């Protein structure tokens, strides 16, 4: 039920340093990562909105030094169907 936040970075390194800075910056739960092929990988964090949007900015700001940051977005409340089908942690 938590809110959502993601970063995807052409480069497994960029994801880690991004995924790191997110955890260190807020009280969010890092669920894992999803491999889309082609060198692109996506980090996934979950938690309250105020936490994520504060954590995510730290990720974007920290990966741009060492990565090709592709996209960064935040969903404050994913509709029930999303959590049900996609692997975003909070899956019954």
């Amino acid at each position: 039920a938590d809110a959502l936040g993601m970063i995807e970075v052409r480069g497994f390194v960029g994801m880690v340093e991004a995924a790191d800075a997110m955890v260190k910056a807020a009280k969010v739960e890092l669920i894992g990562y999803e491999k889309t092929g082609g060198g692109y990988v996506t980090a996934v964090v979950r938690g309250d909105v105020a936490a994520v949007k504060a954590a995510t900015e730290a990720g974007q700001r920290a990966a741009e030094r060492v990565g090709e940051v592709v996209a960064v977005h935040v969903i404050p409340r994913p509709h029930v169907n999303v959590d049900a089908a996609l692997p975003l942690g909070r899956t019954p």
């Binding site: 260190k24 910056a25 807020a26 009280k27 309250d48 909105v49 105020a50 936490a51 504060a54 954590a55 730290a58 700001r61």
Partner: protein
């Protein structure tokens, strides 16, 4: 009223909430929360500003003092939202956006290696925190204004295996001391010095 610091602390790393507390004689924070920091002159408006925060939110304050010169404000709470809400009220009391804060200055930043067995024992006279074991290494920073420093002090242990010495968000200048094994300090200091410039502000 004029503005000096406006720093928003995300989630403090543990050893600060300790050292923060022995420095404070107010509502001590605990590790894992959030806190806010704003410096203004003259140090009475600080006392009024604290209401707009305290009355309009569910926060908790540690620093409200004029033991050094004029005063500085910190409030703490677990939910970033409540704090970010509390902070937003403070600036609006002055009707100045974020970018009205003063750009920080980097006065003296240097790393000292293998401190002499003498000098360790004497520095700890400033025992606000930990002690510099004899012959490790030490990091020292100065910034203007003073409030900006505690942000850096966070980014240290958050980024390296360092022992935290002493912090000065009080005064006309922000001064910092760090201690710990050698290689970390370079990785730690690299984060600290980088933390101050990255701030956006006015000339």
């Amino acid at each position: 009223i004029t503005l000096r610091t406006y720093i928003f602390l995300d989630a403090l790393q543990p050893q600060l909430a300790t050292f923060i507390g022995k420095t404070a004689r107010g509502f001590l924070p605990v590790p894992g929360q959030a806190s806010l920091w704003v410096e203004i002159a003259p140090g009475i408006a600080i006392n009024r500003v604290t209401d707009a925060a305290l009355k309009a939110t569910k926060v908790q304050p540690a620093v409200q003092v004029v033991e050094r010169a004029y005063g500085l404000l910190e409030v703490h709470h677990f939910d970033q939202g409540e704090v970010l809400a509390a902070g937003s009220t403070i600036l609006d009391k002055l009707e100045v956006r974020e970018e009205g804060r003063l750009k920080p200055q980097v006065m003296t930043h240097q790393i000292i290696r293998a401190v002499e067995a003498y000098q360790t024992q004497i520095i700890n006279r400033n025992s606000q925190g930990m002690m510099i074991l004899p012959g490790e290494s030490l990091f020292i920073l100065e910034t203007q204004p003073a409030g900006y420093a505690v942000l850096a002090a966070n980014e240290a242990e958050k980024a390296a295996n360092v022992h935290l010495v002493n912090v000065t968000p009080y005064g006309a200048f922000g001064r910092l001391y760090l201690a710990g094994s050698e290689a970390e300090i370079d990785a730690a200091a690299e984060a600290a010095e980088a933390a101050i410039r990255s701030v956006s502000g006015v000339a």
